[PDB]
Design a protein around this ligand. Structure first.
Ligand SMILES: [Mg+2]
Ligand SMILES: [Mg+2]
Ligand SMILES: [Mg+2]
Ligand SMILES: [Mg+2]
Ligand SMILES: [Mg+2]
Ligand SMILES: [Mg+2]
Ligand SMILES: [Mg+2]
Ligand SMILES: [Mg+2]
Ligand SMILES: [Mg+2]
Ligand SMILES: [Mg+2]
Ligand SMILES: [Mg+2]
Ligand SMILES: [Mg+2]
Ligand SMILES: [Mg+2]
Ligand SMILES: [Mg+2]
Ligand SMILES: [Mg+2]
Ligand SMILES: [Mg+2]
Ligand SMILES: [Mg+2]
Ligand SMILES: [Mg+2]
Ligand SMILES: [Mg+2]
Ligand SMILES: [Mg+2]
Ligand SMILES: [Mg+2]
Ligand SMILES: [Mg+2]
Ligand SMILES: [Mg+2]
Ligand SMILES: [Mg+2]
Ligand SMILES: [Mg+2]
Ligand SMILES: [Mg+2]
Ligand SMILES: [Mg+2]
Ligand SMILES: [Mg+2]
Ligand SMILES: [Zn+2]
Ligand SMILES: [Zn+2]
Lengths: 111, 92, 53, 100, 73
RNA sequence: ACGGAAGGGCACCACCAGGAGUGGAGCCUGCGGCUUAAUUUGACUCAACACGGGGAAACUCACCAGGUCCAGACACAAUAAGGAUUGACAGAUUGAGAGCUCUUUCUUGAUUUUGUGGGUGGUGGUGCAUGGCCGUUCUUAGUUGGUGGAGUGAUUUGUCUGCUUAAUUGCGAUAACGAACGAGACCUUAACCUACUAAAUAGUGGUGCUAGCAUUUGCUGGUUAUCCACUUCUUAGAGGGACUAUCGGUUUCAAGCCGAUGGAAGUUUGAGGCAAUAACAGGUCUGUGAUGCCCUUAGACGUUCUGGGCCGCACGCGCGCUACACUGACGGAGCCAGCGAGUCUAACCUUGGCCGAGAGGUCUUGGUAAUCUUGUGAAACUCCGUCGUGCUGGGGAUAGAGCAUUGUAAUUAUUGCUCUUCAACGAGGAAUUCCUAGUAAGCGCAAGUCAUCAGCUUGCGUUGAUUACGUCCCUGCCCUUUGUACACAC
């Protein structure tokens, strides 16, 4: 029961907060953006990264952690929010990923 | 920071049951969501936990996302008097 | 005590703050997004706001 | 049976794809309908000083968001209703189905 | 920041530390062995006869209904 | 780089021909200085001064007089359940039902307290230690490799003599060839479509019901479940359309330019967005949980409560609003827009009815919005009258009293309304700003900030001129040649 203007700016702010959370949390895993597809029966959140194995962790442990964090923060019901992970196509054609690689190299001490 | 044992163990058992906790960076709130304890107590208890290697934090727009490690789940098991392998937030 | 946070914060520049930078000055309160103008310039293309003219 | 389907997107191409698949579905099922009524695309403007601080030439920046709204009116049984709400989903496109 | 004057009185005066008086919980007991009661207790059904009222002077102060019980013997 | 050197080409942040003006008065607002407990602070030619989206009651807030709290994590050591420690009625005390502190005893029970290290916070300093963003140099057309060529070299050619263009844009010439960036192309918007798709969330016509006048057919209207039909106007989505088309002149006769016709549209159609290389020791740590260093870190520069201040005024500047009246003030009638905003776990935009001179109050209603507020019945405008050249019924500051609203609180008036008071101002000196068509100017409306407070800004539309269509005289820009004893570069 909200106007469409505020509905859509809320969608945008949600996408932005998610992007910032993930680019702070999964920086060591090649986080190269996120998509948000709302639907009947759920909203799904498609992360696009490189180290999908490390995003998943063991038994999807970290995915469960992130689903729970998102749900608790954004007041979703358990089951109405889902997270998927995908190996991003064209890793070289992603600026955020190469910038994070530069960051980690310069921090490890490379020239 | 000093706080009642019942509130501390409320925080700890919620953390063990869920695996995570989200706390708005709003002191003087007096009422955390999903926990009847003060948000200040939540934040500073989990801060004490962070400093001793158990739990880890991310701020991200004034919300203090907290999630625990293996050391944290073992410590909380030992603290809450629960058996070996009772339940973490790790069910498939 | 009961005087730690006594003063009301129901209106004015103290009742609001950016959901990003926790700042009271320069709020964009339009459409209920409540972001400082600087962080809005940062996050506009993510939110869906773009320049056309 | 008086259903209204409103689509409230920002992406004109996705919105028109959804509208086209809906209307051709209703046409191959041969359902009477009021065609896709396109409401005025509403522009959400935000004007801001380009600078964080105050000095410099007073340069202003207007950011816009174009919201495109369509609605279609259908006469349809419950089976076609439930399947239509099952399908016609694309990202960035928000739908509202209402009866009566 | 030039300097601080503290024209206020020299008044770093923080209070007691719940003064460390000696052993307590005296009701008190007879020689072999009947027990008696110091510190007349409350009148509340919530008080399970295990809380002592105080007696400062002309007033008895509670601990369970921590403040509200006041008619003085 | 500079030149009071030359040549060529440009710009209403330059001029010409003019328009509206500012500077002069009152007031609003910002800056300085002065004052002050504090009157927080940054920014000083264009590129500071209605800028910090900065319209400050409290908060905001950073400043002043005072008073609380600790949110000093974690490790170690000490104290220590014969109790570490916490809190507290009443009184004194304090602005204060702040035990803050004290009197007196009660309460709690390992979370703490003290110390050591070590952290955390800081609208604290450094914007000359940085990031990012912005502005400016610079709204001009400029910048750069590779390979060849010239030169010992720094470097140069390419990137050009001419003609052209808004444009290193092109024609072309040619020790250069082929490329890249920028410009342009691109995107958005405004203008055309009686051709497509359609649409009681936009309309129109007809037919039913119905009101009035005429009556002789007719004219003006109303009418949600009266339907029927359609899409010219309105909305969009996909497309078309202009490409300087055609013609005539002019030019080595090439690029192109001028004129006319047609056309909705012929100044790159109009206005914008995006916008190169190199830089400024421009601004900003007071947007940032962006940040190095320094300082401070529990009578803290953290945080929070109360109250003041940021408005303080002998003065000097900047952006503006009102006006100095008949091309007018007032009173009645007439009466026309567009861009937009709006309530959820809330209380927003408010119609209609009633009360009130007024402000406004109250009972309801609709709208999460092309549907309701809202035809946003705006204002300037027009028509009828009053006034009559009189600092006058021009002008409306400065003051007194009262009635309302917002808000915990308006006292140095928050604002609104009523009456009364009725100041300067008689077109503004030296100076100086903006502007070439639906533009200047006049006129108001929405939004931003916002509980309330517009004289400000961002946009919108309404009425709509004069005068160039040129030049490089002033102020500057670009390219070439030239001189230089300059290189933080006249
Ligand atoms: Mg002139
Ligand atoms: Mg004037
Ligand atoms: Mg300039
Ligand atoms: Mg203040
Ligand atoms: Mg204060
Ligand atoms: Mg401070
Ligand atoms: Mg600088
Ligand atoms: Mg800088
Ligand atoms: Mg060479
Ligand atoms: Mg050579
Ligand atoms: Mg070369
Ligand atoms: Mg009719
Ligand atoms: Mg010809
Ligand atoms: Mg153009
Ligand atoms: Mg900064
Ligand atoms: Mg000020
Ligand atoms: Mg200005
Ligand atoms: Mg008058
Ligand atoms: Mg009149
Ligand atoms: Mg209108
Ligand atoms: Mg000038
Ligand atoms: Mg307003
Ligand atoms: Mg004010
Ligand atoms: Mg302002
Ligand atoms: Mg000209
Ligand atoms: Mg000479
Ligand atoms: Mg020299
Ligand atoms: Mg000299
Ligand atoms: Zn912000
Ligand atoms: Zn009792």
């Amino acid at each position: 029961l909200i106007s469409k203007k505020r509905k859509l700016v809320a969608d945008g702010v949600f996408y932005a907060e998610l992007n910032e959370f993930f680019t702070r949390e999964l920086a060591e895993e090649g986080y190269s953006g996120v998509e948000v597809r709302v639907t009947p029966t759920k909203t799904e959140v498609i992360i696009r990264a490189t180290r999908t194995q490390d995003v998943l962790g063991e038994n999807g442990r970290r995915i469960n952690e992130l689903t729970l964090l998102v749900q608790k923060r954004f007041k979703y019901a358990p089951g109405t929010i889902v997270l998927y992970a995908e190996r991003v196509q064209d890793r070289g054609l992603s600026a955020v990923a190469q910038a994070e690689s530069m960051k980690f190299k310069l921090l490890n001490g490379l020239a | 920071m000093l706080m009642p044992k019942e509130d501390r163990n409320k925080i700890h058992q919620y953390l063990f049951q869920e695996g995570v906790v989200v706390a708005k960076k709003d002191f003087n709130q007096a009422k955390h969501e999903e926990i009847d304890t003060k948000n200040l107590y939540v934040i500073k208890a989990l801060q004490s936990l962070t400093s001793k290697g158990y739990v880890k934090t991310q701020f991200s727009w004034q919300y203090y996302y907290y999630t625990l490690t293996e050391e944290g789940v073992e410590y909380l098991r030992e603290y809450l008097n629960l058996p070996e392998h009772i339940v973490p937030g790790t069910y498939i | 005590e009961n005087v730690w946070f006594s003063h009301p914060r129901r209106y004015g520049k103290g009742s609001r703050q950016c959901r990003v930078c926790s700042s009271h000055t320069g709020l964009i309160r339009k459409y209920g997004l409540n972001i400082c103008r600087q962080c809005f310039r940062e996050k506009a293309n993510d939110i869906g706001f773009n320049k056309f003219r | 049976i008086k259903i209204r389907i409103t689509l409230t997107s920002t992406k004109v191409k996705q919105l028109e794809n959804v509208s086209s698949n809906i209307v051709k579905n209703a046409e191959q099922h041969n359902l009477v309908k009021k065609g896709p009524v396109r409401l005025p695309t509403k522009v959400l403007k935000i004007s801001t000083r380009k600078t964080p601080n105050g000095e410099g030439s007073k340069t202003w920046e207007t950011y816009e968001m174009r919201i495109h709204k369509r609605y279609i009116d259908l006469e349809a049984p419950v089976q076609i209703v439930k399947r239509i709400t099952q399908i016609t989903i694309e990202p960035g496109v928000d739908v509202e189905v209402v009866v009566a | 920041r030039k300097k601080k004057v503290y024209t206020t009185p020299k008044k770093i005066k923080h209070k007691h530390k719940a003064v460390k008086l000696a052993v307590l919980s005296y009701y008190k007991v007879d020689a072999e062995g009947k027990v008696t009661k110091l510190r007349r207790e409350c009148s509340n059904p919530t008080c399970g006869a295990g809380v002592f009222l105080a007696n400062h002077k002309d007033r008895l102060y509670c601990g369970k209904c921590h403040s509200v019980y006041k008619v003085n013997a």
